[PDB]
Amino acid sequence: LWNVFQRVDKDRSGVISDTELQQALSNGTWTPFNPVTVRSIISMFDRENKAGVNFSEFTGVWKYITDWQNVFRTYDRDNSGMIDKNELKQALSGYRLSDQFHDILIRKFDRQGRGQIAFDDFIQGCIVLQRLTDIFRRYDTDQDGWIQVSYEQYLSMVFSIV
Amino acid sequence: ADQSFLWNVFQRVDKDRSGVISDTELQQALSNGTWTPFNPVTVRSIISMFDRENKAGVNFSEFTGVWKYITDWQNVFRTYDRDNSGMIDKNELKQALSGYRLSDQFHDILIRKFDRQGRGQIAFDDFIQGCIVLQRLTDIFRRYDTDQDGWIQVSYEQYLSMVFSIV
Ligand SMILES: [Ca+2]
Ligand SMILES: [Ca+2]
Ligand SMILES: [Ca+2]
Ligand SMILES: [Ca+2]
Ligand SMILES: [Ca+2]
Ligand SMILES: [Ca+2]
């Protein structure tokens, strides 16, 4: 791990920045790992609001990304290195989502634009879905799948998301 | 033709002379009456509204849209800042946002949400920000509130679609 951390710390400054974390990562493509995802992950582990991670926080970041990669690999059952619609259907089977909705999700998080989902966009869409579903559940106390909300509640709800 | 004096404004802002005003260039050119830099999120949104090339920036031809847009906001802002103190308070905010028919206390929620100076008033950049977000969120709400009683009822998947429209 130590050895891995120094390698990522390009300028040897003892703190891994966004840029540095991004260049250590591959989305399986010719494009950069999504800088929005790099930053969500860093702010999860950085406790001194400094847009960076030191070694002990980096052990947390690295475990987390490697665990996501394990998930990605588990469901990419043709080893194509992209999650296609039916693989996503497997991956999200615990959400009880319709076929039509998986297309919407792909449209939304697929940055490559070919109707498949790369590792970075996989992480992004999974975390967004998860955050949103939890916020939804705060309203759906009777777990019937429907909510009824006033204009003011709705706004506050969006203010709580983003 | 066309416009000589806007060109000067453009070059001052375009410090690197790349021919494109970036996010940071625009932010450094803009003032909020404060020592904290102009809301970077507000800057990015304005750039996104006028950029037709997806280059994270605006060229001269788009910048005349930017100049007009920011200037129009200055006028709306100076209009509701009735005492010309350079911040908008609850009382002023209530006047600005009449047409929304928002409850009294919701105004405090808006102030907390968007005032980054933490004094209970809203500077010019944070004012644009909340108004942009309010109008955008409201149009999305109106789409779902076909009858306009102020209520929506959505499924989980509809809820997710609606949030995807916004985020
Ligand atoms: Ca470093
Ligand atoms: Ca696959
Ligand atoms: Ca319910
Ligand atoms: Ca420039
Ligand atoms: Ca005032
Ligand atoms: Ca309604």
Author numbering:
A (entry chain B): 28 to 189
B (entry chain A): 2, 24 to 189
Relevant lines from the article:
An alternatively spliced shorter isoform, designated ALG-2ΔGF122, lacks Gly121Phe122 and does not bind Alix, but the structural basis of the incompetence has remained to be elucidated. An asymmetric unit of the crystal of des3-23ALG-2ΔGF122 in the Ca2+-bound form contained two ALG-2 molecules (A and B) as a dimer. In des3-23ALG-2ΔGF122, however, the deletion of Gly121Phe122 caused loss of the third turn in α5 that corresponds to the exiting helix of EF3 (magenta). In the structure of des3-23ALG-2ΔGF122 in the Ca2+-bound form, however, NH2R123 (corresponding to NH2R125 in wild-type ALG-2) did not form such a hydrogen bond. The side chain extended outwardly from the loop as in the case of the structure of the metal-free form, but the spatial positions of the side chains between R123 and Y122 were closer in the equivalent residues in the metal-free ALG-2 (R125 and Y124). Three calcium ions were found in EF1, EF3 and EF5 of des3-23ALG-2ΔGF122 at the canonical EF-hand coordination positions (x, y, z, -y, -x and -z), though water molecules at the -x positions in EF1 and EF3 were absent and no amino acid residue coordinated at the -z position in EF5. On the other hand, the side chain directed toward Pocket 1 in Ca2+-bound des3-23ALG-2ΔGF122, but it did not fully block the entry path of Pocket 1 as in the case of metal-free ALG-2. Since S120 is located within α5 in ALG-2 but is placed at the end of the truncated helix in ALG-2ΔGF122, an α-helix-supporting hydrogen bond between OS120 and NG121 (G123 in wild type) is disrupted. This causes a change in the spatial orientation of OS120, and the hydrogen bond with NH2R125 in wild-type ALG-2 is lost in NH2R123 in ALG-2ΔGF122. The distance between the Cα atoms of Y122 and T160 (facing Pocket 1) is shorter in the crystal structure of des3-23ALG-2ΔGF122 (8.7 Å) than that between the corresponding Y124 and T162 in the Ca2+-bound (9.9 Å) and metal-free structure of des3-20ALG-2 (9.0 Å), indicating a narrower Pocket 1 in the isoform.
